[PDB]
């Protein structure tokens, strides 16, 4: 239970350093530490999207409603949302590039894609956490995120 504290700390820190975008796919979202980092990211101008489960979104105590009220778009598949892992994409290449077109930015702040992944908890735990900056893995996660976002 100590590694989960260390891992969450590293994840919050990664979210704090998000420049343009955060795409999060999670089964249950109860971590106050994660939810607050998303808050600070949103206040920092970062565009954030969240994909979760319809039933778990209204469970106790979910942080989804608190984030959705701040203007964070949340989409849930129906039904239900079964995943093999929860993941977070920070400044994914394709996602940042599409933001470039949306805001029509003349200049780009330097950044790079970071993928955080871990085991799904069905019942604030981040077990089997991996943090890496490989675009090969990034593009795959982004593609999966794009798919669920459509549906
Ligand atoms: Cl989860």
> Of 21, 42, 45, 17, whose CA–CA distance to 97 is shortest?
21
Q: Could you give the CA distance from residue 17 to residue 1 in angstroms, rounded to a whole number?
A: 25
Catalytic residue among 23, 36, 91, 135: 91
| Reported resolution, Å | 2.2
Number of domains in the chain: 1
CATH classification at residue 49 = 3.30.870.10
Q: Active site includes 36?
A: no
- State the structure-solving technique: X-ray
- The residue range of the domain holding 144 is 2-151
Q: Active site includes 86?
A: yes
Catalytic residue among 36, 60, 86, 136: 86
**Cα→Cα distances 129→115, 126, 151, Å:** 10, 6, 27
Q: Active site includes 91?
A: yes
> Of 90, 150, 80, whose CA–CA distance to 122 is shortest?
80
Give the distance (Å) from ligand 1 centre to CA of residue 19. 24
């Amino acid at each position: 239970m100590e590694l989960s504290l260390r891992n969450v700390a590293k994840i919050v820190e990664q979210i704090d350093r998000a420049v343009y975008s955060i795409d999060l796919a999670i089964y249950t979202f109860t971590s106050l530490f994660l939810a607050d980092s998303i808050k600070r990211a949103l206040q920092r101008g970062v565009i954030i999207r969240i994909i979760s489960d319809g039933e778990m979104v209204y469970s106790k105590g979910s942080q989804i409603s608190m984030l959705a009220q701040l203007g964070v778009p949340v989409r849930v598949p129906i039904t239900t949302n079964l995943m093999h892992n929860k993941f977070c994409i920070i400044d994914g290449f394709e996602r940042v590039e599409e933001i470039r077109l949306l805001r029509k930015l003349k200049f780009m702040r330097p950044c790079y894609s970071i993928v955080i992944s871990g085991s799904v908890n069905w019942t604030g735990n981040w077990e089997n956490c991996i943090i890496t900056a490989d675009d090969k893995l990034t593009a795959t996660f982004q593609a999966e995120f794009q798919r669920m976002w459509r549906a």
